[PDB]
Amino acid sequence: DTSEKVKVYLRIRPFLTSELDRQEDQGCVCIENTETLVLQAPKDSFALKSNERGVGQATHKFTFSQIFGPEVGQVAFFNLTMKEMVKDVLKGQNWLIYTYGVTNSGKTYTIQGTSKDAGILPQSLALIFNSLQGQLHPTPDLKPLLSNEVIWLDSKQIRQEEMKKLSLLIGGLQEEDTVPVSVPADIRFSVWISFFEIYNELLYDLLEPPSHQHKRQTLRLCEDQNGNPYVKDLNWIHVRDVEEAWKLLKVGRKNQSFASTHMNQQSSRSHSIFSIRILHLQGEGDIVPKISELSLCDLAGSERCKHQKSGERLKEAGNINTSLHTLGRCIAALRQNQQNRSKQNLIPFRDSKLTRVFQGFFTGRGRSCMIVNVNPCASTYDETLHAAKFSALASQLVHAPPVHLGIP
Amino acid sequence: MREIVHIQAGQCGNQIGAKFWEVISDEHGIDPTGSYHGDSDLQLERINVYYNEATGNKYVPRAILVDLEPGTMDSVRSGPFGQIFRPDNFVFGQSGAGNNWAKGHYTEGAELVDSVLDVVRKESESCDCLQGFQLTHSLGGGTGSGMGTLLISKIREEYPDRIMNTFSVMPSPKVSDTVVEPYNATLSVHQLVENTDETYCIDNEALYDICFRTLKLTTPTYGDLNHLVSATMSGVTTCLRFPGQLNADLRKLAVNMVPFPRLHFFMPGFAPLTSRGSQQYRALTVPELTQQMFDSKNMMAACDPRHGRYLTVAAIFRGRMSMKEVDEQMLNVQNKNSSYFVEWIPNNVKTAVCDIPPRGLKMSATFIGNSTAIQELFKRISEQFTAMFRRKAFLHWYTGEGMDEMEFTEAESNMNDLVSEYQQYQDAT
Amino acid sequence: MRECISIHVGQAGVQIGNACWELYCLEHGIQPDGQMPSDKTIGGGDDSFNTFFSETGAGKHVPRAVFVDLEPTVIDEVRTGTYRQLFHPEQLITGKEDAANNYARGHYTIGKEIIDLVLDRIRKLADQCTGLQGFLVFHSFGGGTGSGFTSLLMERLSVDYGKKSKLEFSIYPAPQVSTAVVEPYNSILTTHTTLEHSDCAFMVDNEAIYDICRRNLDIERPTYTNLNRLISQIVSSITASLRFDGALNVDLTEFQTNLVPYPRIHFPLATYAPVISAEKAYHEQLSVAEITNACFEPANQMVKCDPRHGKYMACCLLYRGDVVPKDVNAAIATIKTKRSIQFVDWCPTGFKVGINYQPPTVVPGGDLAKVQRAVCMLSNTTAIAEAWARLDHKFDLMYAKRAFVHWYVGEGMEEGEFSEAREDMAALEKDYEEVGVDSVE
Numbered sequence A: 001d002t003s004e005k006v007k008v009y010l011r012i013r014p015f016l017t018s019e020l021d022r023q024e025d026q027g028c029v030c031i032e033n034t035e036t037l038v039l040q041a042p043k044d045s046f047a048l049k050s051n052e053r054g055v056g057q058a059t060h061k062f063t064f065s066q067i068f069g070p071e072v073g074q075v076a077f078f079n080l081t082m083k084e085m086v087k088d089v090l091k092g093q094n095w096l097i098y099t100y101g102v103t104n105s106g107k108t109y110t111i112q113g114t115s116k117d118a119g120i121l122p123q124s125l126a127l128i129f130n131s132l133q134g135q136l137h138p139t140p141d142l143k144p145l146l147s148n149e150v151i152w153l154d155s156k157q158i159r160q161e162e163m164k165k166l167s168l169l170i171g172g173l174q175e176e177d178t179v180p181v182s183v184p185a186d187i188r189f190s191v192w193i194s195f196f197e198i199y200n201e202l203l204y205d206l207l208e209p210p211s212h213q214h215k216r217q218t219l220r221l222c223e224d225q226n227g228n229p230y231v232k233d234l235n236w237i238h239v240r241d242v243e244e245a246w247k248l249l250k251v252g253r254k255n256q257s258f259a260s261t262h263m264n265q266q267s268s269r270s271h272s273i274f275s276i277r278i279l280h281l282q283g284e285g286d287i288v289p290k291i292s293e294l295s296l297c298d299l300a301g302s303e304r305c306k307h308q309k310s311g312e313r314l315k316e317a318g319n320i321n322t323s324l325h326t327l328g329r330c331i332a333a334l335r336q337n338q339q340n341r342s343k344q345n346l347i348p349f350r351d352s353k354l355t356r357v358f359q360g361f362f363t364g365r366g367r368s369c370m371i372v373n374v375n376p377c378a379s380t381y382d383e384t385l386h387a388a389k390f391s392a393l394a395s396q397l398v399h400a401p402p403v404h405l406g407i408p
Numbered sequence B: 001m002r003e004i005v006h007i008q009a010g011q012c013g014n015q016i017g018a019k020f021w022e023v024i025s026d027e028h029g030i031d032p033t034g035s036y037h038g039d040s041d042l043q044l045e046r047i048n049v050y051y052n053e054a055t056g057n058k059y060v061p062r063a064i065l066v067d068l069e070p071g072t073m074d075s076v077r078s079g080p081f082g083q084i085f086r087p088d089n090f091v092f093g094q095s096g097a098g099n100n101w102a103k104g105h106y107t108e109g110a111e112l113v114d115s116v117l118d119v120v121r122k123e124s125e126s127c128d129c130l131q132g133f134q135l136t137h138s139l140g141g142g143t144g145s146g147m148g149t150l151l152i153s154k155i156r157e158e159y160p161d162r163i164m165n166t167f168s169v170m171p172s173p174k175v176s177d178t179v180v181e182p183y184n185a186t187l188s189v190h191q192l193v194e195n196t197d198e199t200y201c202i203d204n205e206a207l208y209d210i211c212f213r214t215l216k217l218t219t220p221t222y223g224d225l226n227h228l229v230s231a232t233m234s235g236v237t238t239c240l241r242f243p244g245q246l247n248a249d250l251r252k253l254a255v256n257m258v259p260f261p262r263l264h265f266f267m268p269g270f271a272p273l274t275s276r277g278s279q280q281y282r283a284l285t286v287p288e289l290t291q292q293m294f295d296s297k298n299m300m301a302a303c304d305p306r307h308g309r310y311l312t313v314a315a316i317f318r319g320r321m322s323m324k325e326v327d328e329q330m331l332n333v334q335n336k337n338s339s340y341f342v343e344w345i346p347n348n349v350k351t352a353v354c355d356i357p358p359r360g361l362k363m364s365a366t367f368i369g370n371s372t373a374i375q376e377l378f379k380r381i382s383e384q385f386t387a388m389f390r391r392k393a394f395l396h397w398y399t400g401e402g403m404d405e406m407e408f409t410e411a412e413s414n415m416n417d418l419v420s421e422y423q424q425y426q427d428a429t
Numbered sequence C: 001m002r003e004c005i006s007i008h009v010g011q012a013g014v015q016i017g018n019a020c021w022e023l024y025c026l027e028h029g030i031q032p033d034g035q036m037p038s039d040k041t042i043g044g045g046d047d048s049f050n051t052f053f054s055e056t057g058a059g060k061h062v063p064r065a066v067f068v069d070l071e072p073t074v075i076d077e078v079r080t081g082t083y084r085q086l087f088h089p090e091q092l093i094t095g096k097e098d099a100a101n102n103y104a105r106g107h108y109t110i111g112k113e114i115i116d117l118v119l120d121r122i123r124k125l126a127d128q129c130t131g132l133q134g135f136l137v138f139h140s141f142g143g144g145t146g147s148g149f150t151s152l153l154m155e156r157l158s159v160d161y162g163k164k165s166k167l168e169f170s171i172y173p174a175p176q177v178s179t180a181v182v183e184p185y186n187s188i189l190t191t192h193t194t195l196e197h198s199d200c201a202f203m204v205d206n207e208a209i210y211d212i213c214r215r216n217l218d219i220e221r222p223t224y225t226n227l228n229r230l231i232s233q234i235v236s237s238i239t240a241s242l243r244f245d246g247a248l249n250v251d252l253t254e255f256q257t258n259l260v261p262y263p264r265i266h267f268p269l270a271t272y273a274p275v276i277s278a279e280k281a282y283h284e285q286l287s288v289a290e291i292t293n294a295c296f297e298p299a300n301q302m303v304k305c306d307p308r309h310g311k312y313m314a315c316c317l318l319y320r321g322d323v324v325p326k327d328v329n330a331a332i333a334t335i336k337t338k339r340s341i342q343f344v345d346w347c348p349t350g351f352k353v354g355i356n357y358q359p360p361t362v363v364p365g366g367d368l369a370k371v372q373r374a375v376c377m378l379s380n381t382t383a384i385a386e387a388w389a390r391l392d393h394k395f396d397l398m399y400a401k402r403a404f405v406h407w408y409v410g411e412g413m414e415e416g417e418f419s420e421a422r423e424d425m426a427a428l429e430k431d432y433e434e435v436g437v438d439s440v441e
């Protein structure tokens, strides 16, 4: 490869009027260049100038593949990042999107959200569907259950799936490209979607509506004939237009677990995985037509456990932390798997459920990419630093000559 | 207070449990009836780590016997220490697995796991604060391996934050008394790595070697092997029940012994061990105990540490002794044998000291080693496994119980990965 | 009144507290049951001095102490031993599960629901104190409760009280000897506590005290009971001036003002000079000059380091017994004459002297011989930086490969904190390198 690395992408949310008046733009974050960021603590009058044991500046430089400031719009941000990746997916390859952030980082705004200012998810969905417009099979006849195998549907099974999706859509219903077609009139493109989560290292589906208080969706992680892993007994839904898929994901996120935090706010406590699989079946069709998987993973933000130390949440908090740590190690191995070093190392993907589910893409069956969204406000500065330490390609300490006070 | 719930499955598990409970009851001065006829006051200070108190000052152990088929029932209940156990904890069935992992895991054990889980929940709910569970069983067998793995899975699903400790009797390479050992061993090893906190590997060849070469016994029986394993089990958790200068528990041993989550396969050992006639010719001191522990011929795992490197070791001493001598001896062992210790851990040896020794001894010590050489015991098994799976030697028995061939292959891969995960650190770096 | 409150955290804390309170009870004539025959016999004086004891109506004397273990096996020995009737029943065991040598457990997940009880007990003790104040915190790096719970406790104390001295007595890890593999993580993660909140921190090493016992007292096979006794002697020498009369008294404020040049530099080294056996108590004069010289020997230090490799920035000599200022001044002059002992240019005086009339007491069963005079030296030197640097190296060897990190991460702690702690240590080390440089005109 041409030094792929993992192609991290940092996005800075613009300041809000409701927060700028509170004196949050303290110069903590500023873009040195499109490849480097510098982070500075809220020192001087922004914090208590008294004492300050060696915290005069506390400046840290971080290296990123690309940094996108507030000047970049939603469509502009999507076009320069994911459009090439959407093209690569419609070619026939697979892809993933890791997304990391904290409250006020705007990751939920970046990936999904307002219909007008479409996020990464709806924009990619629209490009994918507009690209294959006029190449949709008349009916569903095939399930992408496994990453390399298929299940055939009869008329009764097709009707049952139709009833399933109709019941899922009608319940909880509120209000909240073609020109570069790969190969029309020779290969039909069928699109299926699934959505689940990891929670306390237990897998749980999300397309199943709230059947009962108990979440008896403990999906088991099996391995196929070739040893590739796969979640067992996961629901998949055929989609005919962009609005159906988007609405199904709103229902899935509605089912998604949420919990309060140490402010008057609510946030996710699970690693949610969304998957869209495109079956390319040529006129011949043969068996198990080509399959192309695009996945997105919204990761629970790492949060400190001192302020949160009340209730059982602490438990899941720890679990979340552990999972993310393992993920980082895997990425580090993938940043050493590069021929850059000759020793090489084993990727410890088996140490957690989340890494194990993504086995083929650390092994080399696919390509992965990461996004980190950051709140530039000073009050969250420490959190931003942690996010940088999770996602930075490299870090540098300028050593800050004004630091080391007390001593003359 | 920290309480341990004990589970034992299969013939081997039941026999080890019987000997272990005899040992512990003698340690705490408990007669076969259940009454306490000891002398020291410290014996009752922490007796409820293992026992529950009945009405008339009678103590009943927290023992659960998983598959006490009548063949093993009549041996255990009619023994010297059979009446001590609660009758309701004797869970049992008929028409056992018969050296078939599929029967233990899917067909027969699945019909009996619910009662065992009910008893386990009843026992655990009756405790003040649970430290963790303790399992004894044998791989290469039937009901033992299969239903022990099933119980481990269910228990860790129900009680994830507690400690899951297992004493597994591995199948020896040469001393074999069953033909389908590799299949059950491979599947059990696949199940254990994902669902246990610490697992001690015991091999019958090593215990026979200890009986012959060290204790000079001419006609050893399974009683002596159970005796050694029971001594190890008592020595692991000595500091949970008695005071000492430097305390430890199962969690503290685990944190100091597992650098990464999947590397939790230990080799246990015990000292002193000498013949009856040769005890008068050697003085009992800390250097002698350290020398005997770190010797390669004393380990119960049937793996030579000299073929690998010690990722991390732990020593629990029992008896009145000096801390300086212990620390100096461990430092000397580390310095003199620097080839057999990983460089990226500056200090590999954890030390704990307990004041109260065993009943008849002046000093004693228990060793828990974690080294890469353990991979050897897997590799042999894997070899035998493929020698039977390349041609489907006895595969139809397992597939006739509703268990696809893929579950075999997956297990192989996982086991192989574990071996590879232990091979990184043998190479100097 | 002249009063202090002793906190002891962890197993090392509890055992050091046992030794210390044995020594205090013998010093003040208090029986193990709290009664004093001497007070009734004489009918005057305050022999149960308020520095360490509180008098109730019936003549019983209660220690001004509280210790916590998170592990009942240690403090239940106190509840059963000979001193069971001395302490208040508020010896806060909450050890349904210990910290398992994990800083995160002691600090985040199991340290809570116990901190409130500790703070309530400390508040109740402090309300009884109508006079001077100062906390004495005993603990050990390398453990979970000794590091995490100490961090949380000091963080809360610095907010609740603020302008009160908080002296520390820490069992620093040894350079080679150890009893754990995850020791450096806990030791380095305690830097924030011992820097921000502590006002003065004394560090001691087990290897150094083993060497002292082996060489001076001729004990071939010592145990922790001797180490704790020596540490108790040091602590009693520090706080003697608050209890007994003397020619020159040194309060804790006087102690800190003459020894802490800058706020970030509060890590002195301790030494007890006349450590000697009963057999070797003879054949020696044990005059002021000899003990003052012995305080400066590298071999007698209580931390494994070499003051010859660094520079002395301030010293506090505290004498007890048949001592006179004249011989003390002569000894300081002789020490100043020597060129093997180097002093920074920015401290031309570099000596604080305090004298107390009460000679040290001998504990029966102890291995220290009865003597007429003694001296404790507490000296702030840059050589202590060495004792940190070695430890840092060990930490690096375990953090490059991320060994043992998942245990800390899964108990509610970010990974980045590790790096933060290391950076803090580096900064402190650099400071100790920069104060020792000679002035440039």
Ligand SMILES: CC(=O)O[C@H]1C(=O)[C@@]2(C)[C@H]([C@H](OC(=O)c3ccccc3)[C@]3(O)C[C@H](OC(=O)[C@H](O)[C@@H](NC(=O)c4ccccc4)c4ccccc4)C(C)=C1C3(C)C)[C@]1(OC(C)=O)CO[C@@H]1C[C@@H]2O
Pocket: B022, B023, B026, B027, B215, B224, B225, B227, B228, B230, B231, B232, B234, B235, B272, B273, B274, B275, B276, B279, B358, B359, B360, B361
């Ligand atoms: C003095 C003498 O002539 O006999 C001693 C003895 O010193 C020897 C013979 C004993 C003896 O050990 C054996 O012969 C033996 C045989 C098979 C398996 C294990 C041991 C002894 O049986 C073992 C026994 O050990 C104990 O008493 C411990 O408390 C031990 N007890 C049990 O395990 C036990 C088992 C069932 C019922 C009651 C107690 C123990 C060890 C660790 C933790 C708890 C308890 C002792 C001192 C002896 C005899 C009796 C000969 C030795 O073993 C132990 C454990 O001490 C063998 O190496 C030591 C040293 C000696 O050779």
Ligand SMILES: Nc1nc2c(ncn2[C@@H]2O[C@H](COP(=O)(O)OP(=O)(O)OP(=O)(O)O)[C@@H](O)[C@H]2O)c(=O)[nH]1
Pocket: B245, B246, B247, C009, C010, C011, C012, C013, C015, C016, C069, C070, C071, C098, C099, C100, C101, C102, C140, C141, C142, C143, C144, C145, C146, C147, C171, C178, C179, C206, C224, C225, C227, C228
């Ligand atoms: N000098 C001295 N050191 C001690 C004593 N007791 C314990 N230590 C030291 O304490 C260190 C480990 O601390 P721990 O035994 O874990 O006690 P802790 O700090 O409370 O941690 P926990 O075990 O979780 O309670 C060891 O390195 C010992 O050297 C003592 O009595 N004297």
Ligand SMILES: Nc1nc2c(ncn2[C@@H]2O[C@H](COP(=O)(O)OP(=O)(O)O)[C@@H](O)[C@H]2O)c(=O)[nH]1
Pocket: B009, B010, B011, B012, B013, B015, B016, B097, B098, B099, B138, B139, B140, B141, B142, B143, B144, B145, B169, B171, B177, B178, B204, B222, B223, B225, B226
């Ligand atoms: N160490 C030891 N091993 C035993 C004992 N009894 C049987 N075994 C071993 O256990 C294996 C047979 O397992 P088994 O007990 O039949 O399992 P089960 O059929 O599920 O009850 C063989 O490899 C034996 O060597 C014993 O008392 N001690």
Ligand SMILES: [Mg+2]
Pocket: B247, C011, C071, C098
């Ligand atoms: Mg402890």
